Amino acid sequence: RWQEDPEPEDENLYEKNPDSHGYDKDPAVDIWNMRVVFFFGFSIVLVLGSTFVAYLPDYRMQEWARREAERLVKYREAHGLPIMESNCFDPSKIQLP
Amino acid sequence: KYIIPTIMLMPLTWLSKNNMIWVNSTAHSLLISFTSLLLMNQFGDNSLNFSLLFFSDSLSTPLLILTMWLLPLMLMASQHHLSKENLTRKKLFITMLISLQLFLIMTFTAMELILFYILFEATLVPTLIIITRWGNQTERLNAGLYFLFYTLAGSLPLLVALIYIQNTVGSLNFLMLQYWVQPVHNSWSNVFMWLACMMAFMVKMPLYGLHLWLPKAHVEAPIAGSMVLAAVLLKLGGYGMLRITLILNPMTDFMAYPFIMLSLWGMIMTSSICLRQTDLKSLIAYSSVSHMALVIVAILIQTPWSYMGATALMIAHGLTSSMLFCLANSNYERIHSRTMILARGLQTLLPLMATWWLLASLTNLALPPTINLIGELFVVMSTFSWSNITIILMGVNMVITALYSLYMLIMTQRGKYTYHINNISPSFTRENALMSLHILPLLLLTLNPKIILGPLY
Amino acid sequence: XXXXXXXXXXXXXXXXXXXXXXXXXXXXXXXXXXXXXXXXXXXXXXXXXXXXXXXXXXXXXXXXXXXXXXXXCQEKDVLCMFEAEMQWRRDYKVDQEIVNIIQERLKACQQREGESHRQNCAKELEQFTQVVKAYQDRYXXXXXXXXXXXXXXXXXXXXXXXXXXXXXX
Amino acid sequence: XXXXXXXXXXXXXXXXXXXXXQAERLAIRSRLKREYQLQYYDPSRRGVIEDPALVRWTYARSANIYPNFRPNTKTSLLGALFGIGPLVFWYYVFKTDRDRKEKLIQEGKLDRTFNISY
Amino acid sequence: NMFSSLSLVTLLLLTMPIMMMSFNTYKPSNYPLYVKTAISYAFITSMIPTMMFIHSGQELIISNWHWLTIQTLKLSLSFKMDYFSMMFIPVALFVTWSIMEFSMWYMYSDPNINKFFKYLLLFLITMLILVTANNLFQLFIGWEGVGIMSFLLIGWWYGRADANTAALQAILYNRIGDIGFILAMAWFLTNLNTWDLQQIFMLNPSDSNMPLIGLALAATGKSAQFGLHPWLPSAMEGPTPVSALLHSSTMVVAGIFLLIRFYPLTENNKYIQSITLCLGAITTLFTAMCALTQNDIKKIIAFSTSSQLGLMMVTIGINQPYLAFLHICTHAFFKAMLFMCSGSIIHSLNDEQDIRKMGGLFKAMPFTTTALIVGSLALTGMPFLTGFYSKDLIIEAANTSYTNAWALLMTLIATSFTAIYSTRIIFFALLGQPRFPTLVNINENNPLLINSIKRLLIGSLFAGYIISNNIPPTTIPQMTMPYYLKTTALIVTILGFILALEISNMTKNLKYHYPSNAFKFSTLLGYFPTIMHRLAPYMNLSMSQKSASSLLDLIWLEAILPKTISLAQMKASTLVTNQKGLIKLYFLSFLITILISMILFNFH
Amino acid sequence: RLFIIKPSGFYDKRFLKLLRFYILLTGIPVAIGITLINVXXXXXXXXXXXXXXXXXXXXXXXXXXXX
Amino acid sequence: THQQKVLRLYKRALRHLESWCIHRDKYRYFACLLRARFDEHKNEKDMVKATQLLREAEEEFWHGQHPQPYIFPESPGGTSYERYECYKVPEWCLDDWHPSEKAMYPDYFAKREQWKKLRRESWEREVXXXXXXXXXXXXXXXXXXXXXXXXXXXXXXXXXXXXXXX
């Protein structure tokens, strides 16, 4: 005996009494939500957001370092012999052992 | 800027009328996610702190954007479910996602370890209520108890680990202050200091041993498929392994050596089982073990090249596996069973969703540089500098990466469907929108993947 | 320009003496396509460049030099270390792209000679070997991920080898 | 697996026991087909049929894990050597390669001069 | 300046249908014709820079879209227009040019007529990336891209069974070939900081680890070879223009194409020289043997590519990159004709893919049969049928070397073996009495067919006039042995055809002869479906099911926390169910507790 | 003439129309983005004089939209 | 059954013969030779001798068993398009078509609606007729034919109607 356990029924919107919809019940709620504001995020976050990502606001010295390096190369080539790296941030250290 | 408008989503769902609810929760979340990309991306040479230590800046975390990307997406696929039940029950399990979103933002933003810990385990509470309810099949509790007693058993040793560091060496706090840290002398007393910090992240990032936490959470489905995306967020939610290994134990890598070997066998054996399995959701559940196992390998090498592949794979897997689970949910809502063999039929009945099935499957493999080629290949290149033998084992895994994807395709690409009579409508306008909102952000990362991998990039 | 060396000047001059034929297929197509749409593209580019008129100069490159090195200030303190650690990370990010320019000098040599390859150049080959060897020793490349505090230990490791070897000989 | 001769039509006899054996097979085959016939050929259904045989097939791997394994014997220990064993196998492979590498860095350099990546 | 501008035009023209694919403008029935018109003008725009290359000019271009700035690296979309890369573009475009207008006749009146052209353009674009690749990261986009688009093309026919086995294996054996290719990436980055292809020419290292377990292992995955080749006859299950492209110009070059570009590495290393020819020795005869026994129209041409690939592997082993690409460029014109002229028979006589049932006589079909005679003789060593300008130059060069003698002797048998399967298209099916496949079978020439085959004849005849003469060579091979080396290349084709005609006619024209049942045939398939379709998928799945799943991943690896539940509940029962009430029992335990604190624990 | 094999089509073709309508709706600032380089000047390389370090945009080269 | 086992082997032997021989005139020569071999034992009925020949029939045939046999066109299994060329569309998808698109070509939709109404009414009558057959278990081997002439439709209606078209 189940008494009250049997209550399960198959439910699907599909097309019957909905015409063509995504939201369950009411045609007025469906059009204004599932096609407007659902695709408003598709227009602002994806299309208008594509301008940002990494392009435009430099992004962690990716474009800045190229202009900085080139002027340091031409300066050190004319005067000094060693190119850039020779002794990195070390000038007269107080012994070792 | 980030927190406060996320908190205001809680009174939004309750104050709004019974006919609406879903329209307000999805639309308002999309404009907050736009503003996250607007401000967080700006950084100098070393990423400077945001404000006072409550929520801080991002140094090597574009993974926060992914949480903001799923912030509306965790509501789209859950629309098919929950609709049959009470209106008060609908509002409750939207706010549990809002609480998840509240705690998940706090984990990635706040540059801490002490207060980060009480946000690390805090994500487990809303997911527990999510998993233990709405499960269509039984053994919810044989997955719900296993959800905590795997994680909390490994993560509670952080209380005896993190506090022990701040009592001896200054304070943990900002991490930008954390340069007081002296290299570990490597002794038998220092063994359990390293293990307690690791074992917490050894569970959330699944290995070969103590990996059964993940398949139980995926097979026994919480709600439809949108909550399984939050289970993907928990894998990448254990991101503190990027921070602990670099700062707290720089000299210690000798004790990491056995843990790499465990994760290396968690690549062949975890893939082999992911072939003859019956459940469609399980064949994503075990492929997610091996894909996140690649990250654990990269962390323990500690090379600057490996962290590039590590940070890429966190975002790569976070939008490919979640994409695969939405496809699993789209078959679960029509056939009403997670069986792969029974649910058979693409193109003939599902004409446009089959192209989304192809794009999601091939992204698991190394396609033209989307994110996974910048993810997987970078780790394989970094493993050779560790040892020459690795690619002999890693190359075999590259064969079976096809065997996740193509076996999921072929066992659905048969146009028979003799037993099945359902699935009249192929996909609703929201269902096709779900599939586009996962792949097209990755397709935009082809042009500039600087905001996909950035630990000193 | 200025920074990039490259070749001085290319010859490139056609003679065309053997066989009358239809002059040359390469020469006739070059003269025809230069006025067909290549001249129109040059006119459209000049029309947009002149339309700009007013333009901002802008600072572009920023200064900020030295501000005390990391191998001068010691002991764990946020007030002194933070300025020193920012300086080392500035140098490390630039030196990543310094090598890139020298690498591109070797890239320019390979195409311009082709058949010669390794027989000539020599100047770009010697310049690449000197920098990369110095980059391997000084700017990490062996001492894990980037850290300014660990860099002083890496410099001390190279200095210890110089003191030990010279004392024996 | 294959024998000396491939089994397809090898060794067949009519007899009396074999004649009733095929009658036993068709008795279950027709019984399970007719309940499918009653479910397939009606427009009133609309949905995916359960089938008790297919559910028990999925239940064989997803469940029946701890109800089994109660006789461990020597078969379980052989499986442990095929699992935990190969993890110890690479321990004498990766360490020997690393000790080969670490000795080269300190004395007699083997690393390339044009190396800078990681 | 014109060289750099016109080079990108060929790249943009192929992407223009993809740009108009996403709705944009409505095109009913015109979309298959739109692909034909796009590639037609793409050939003319590619002909001019090749004509410039004969005169003077060489240019390398980057689009400045460098997506990598990671650790001393720049990775822009690089396009190389040099010798091997430059000459291959108009050759590959002219091959496709006929196949696209062929695709109008074959696969007609289908619901997925538009979608078939969609993947073929991507199959053309990904190849063009691989051809012009100057970065090793750019090289992966092409080498995987062609291998991944093949899934949609081989398994194009939506079959419930057997059709999807070929599409799975096409990537499965390719990804075992990837093991080397990805190892070739990792070695290149660690040993050389440059990572791009522009490094190898200066400061070249002498190491055996790079080309052997790397480029040669990549050459076994992609482009047939001996290592893994069961995917060749299975690929014939798909449509005929797909099987044409995979084995003429596109998928068939991908393995060899890498080895030609890495030519300074092959010359310096001596151990690589031997192993490329030793593996190349097995490719020559073993695959050619399989063409004899296997009796299917498409499947004979499938195994003929791998026998031709043996000579393509010898060119790398002999250290001649200049003669390496010349064979493949002429091979592109050989089998663009041969695949679909034979494919024209399949569509004509209902749906028959067997040579036994087919009886397409020379008198019955006038246009298709003429291409079959020319195409088959072109593969063999013929003096002016474009065979001498590709095949014979390798054989003459191979004899004068310090290389392996057994590898040299094995190639000589294979050159005479080409005559057997080429005549097994003519004598077995075309020539003699018709087999009559079906009662009342219609076979007629279409307007689309005439414009495709006749314009392929220019490419199959003038290939030894344009390509061989214009391209500047290095070191002349023909000098020594007029009868032993020079004559042997031409005599093998003559003696081979005479041996083929005598053996075939003895079995066909006999009436009463009785075929013998007992035979020593290790030739039917080469016993690769017995080890790689029977044993290799079983051994990976038996270790997955008998081990792994039924032992570790569900029981033993789980047995950490259920171990602390089964023992925890036993410890739980020893406190709750223990002591069945009674104040008596609890107070008896308090007697001991005071004695523990006084005697057992030392405190006062 | 034949009835032929039938698919859904109506649900499939509508989504591609609904997707592209919102691409075209935000395709206007893409068209303005081209004219921003055309009408307004981008950037010129020049040495900075000691007067002002940062005004509106601190340091930005190429594109007016970056500033 | 003894008769069926001989016919199944004889059908296979003829189709396996054309793989060894090339020409059709040579095929007819060996076909007459096969007839003379089996007619010698067919004349007399045996219980032991005929069954011994049936197991002997597997031999000689298995010695020359794999020369890659011809299945000609679309055949059950074998080679060259077994399920290919025919992708097909299920009958369930036909009724699934949405309005506006369903309005185009109304002749196909109205005729299918008339057949669907007839199938719905006959389903109740077919269910009682199927259980009316004497077995009292479920079914015996194959489905039973219709006895009534007025009602029509022999048990299954969607078995033959709406299948596949190339």
Curated annotation (Swiss-Prot), chain A:
Compositional bias of kind Basic and acidic residues: 13-24
Highest taxon above the source species: Eukaryota
Role, per record: Accessory subunit of the mitochondrial membrane respiratory chain NADH dehydrogenase (Complex I), that is believed not to be involved in catalysis. Complex I functions in the transfer of electrons from NADH to the respiratory chain. The immediate electron acceptor for the enzyme is believed to be ubiquinone.
Membrane topology, record value: Single-pass membrane protein
Main localisation: mitochondrion
Keywords: Electron transport, Membrane, Mitochondrion, Mitochondrion inner membrane, Respiratory chain, Transit peptide, Transmembrane, Transmembrane helix, Transport
Organism: Bos taurus (Bovine)
Keyword Cell membrane tagged: no
Record family assignment: Belongs to the complex I NDUFB11 subunit family.
Location relative to the cell: Mitochondrion inner membrane
Region Disordered: start-end pairs: 1-24
Known partners and oligomeric status: Complex I is composed of 45 different subunits. Interacts with BCAP31.
Protein name per UniProt: NADH dehydrogenase [ubiquinone] 1 beta subcomplex subunit 11, mitochondrial
Record gene name: NDUFB11
From Swiss-Prot, chain D:
Top-level taxon: Eukaryota
Subcellular location: Mitochondrion inner membrane
Transmembrane domains' residue ranges: 75-94
One Gene Ontology cellular component annotation held by this UniProt entry: mitochondrial inner membrane
Keywords tagged on the record: Acetylation, Electron transport, Membrane, Mitochondrion, Mitochondrion inner membrane, Phosphoprotein, Respiratory chain, Transmembrane, Transmembrane helix, Transport
Membrane topology per record: Single-pass membrane protein
Chief site of localization: mitochondrion
Family stated for the protein in its record: Belongs to the complex I NDUFB4 subunit family.
Subunit structure, as described in the record: Complex I is composed of 45 different subunits.
Role description: Accessory subunit of the mitochondrial membrane respiratory chain NADH dehydrogenase (Complex I), that is believed not to be involved in catalysis. Complex I functions in the transfer of electrons from NADH to the respiratory chain. The immediate electron acceptor for the enzyme is believed to be ubiquinone.
Name the UniProt record assigns to this protein: NADH dehydrogenase [ubiquinone] 1 beta subcomplex subunit 4
The species this protein was found in: Bos taurus
Source lineage: Eukaryota, Metazoa, Chordata, Craniata, Vertebrata
Residue span relative to the full protein: 33 to 129 of 129
Curated annotation (Swiss-Prot), chain F:
Family under the similarity heading: Belongs to the complex I NDUFB5 subunit family.
Subcellular location: Mitochondrion inner membrane
Source species, domain of life: Eukaryota
Upper taxonomic lineage: Eukaryota, Metazoa, Chordata, Craniata, Vertebrata
Annotated organism of origin: Bos taurus
Subunit structure: Complex I is composed of 45 different subunits.
Section of the entire sequence shown: 53 to 91 of 189
Functional summary from the UniProt entry: Accessory subunit of the mitochondrial membrane respiratory chain NADH dehydrogenase (Complex I), that is believed not to be involved in catalysis. Complex I functions in the transfer of electrons from NADH to the respiratory chain. The immediate electron acceptor for the enzyme is believed to be ubiquinone.
Transmembrane segments: 21-39
UniProt protein name: NADH dehydrogenase [ubiquinone] 1 beta subcomplex subunit 5, mitochondrial
Swiss-Prot record, chain G:
GO cellular component: mitochondrial inner membrane; mitochondrion; respiratory chain complex I
Residues found modified as Phosphoserine: S75
Subcellular location(s) per record: Mitochondrion inner membrane
Domain of life, per lineage: Eukaryota
Keywords: Acetylation, Electron transport, Membrane, Mitochondrion, Mitochondrion inner membrane, Phosphoprotein, Respiratory chain, Transport
Protein topology in the membrane: Peripheral membrane protein
GO BP, one annotated term: mitochondrial electron transport, NADH to ubiquinone
UniProt entry tagged with the keyword Ligase: no
Quaternary structure and interacting proteins, as annotated: Mammalian complex I is composed of 45 different subunits.
Family statement drawn from the similarity comment of this UniProt entry: Belongs to the complex I LYR family.
Functional summary from the UniProt entry: Accessory subunit of the mitochondrial membrane respiratory chain NADH dehydrogenase (Complex I), that is believed to be not involved in catalysis. Complex I functions in the transfer of electrons from NADH to the respiratory chain. The immediate electron acceptor for the enzyme is believed to be ubiquinone.
Name of the protein in question: NADH dehydrogenase [ubiquinone] 1 beta subcomplex subunit 9
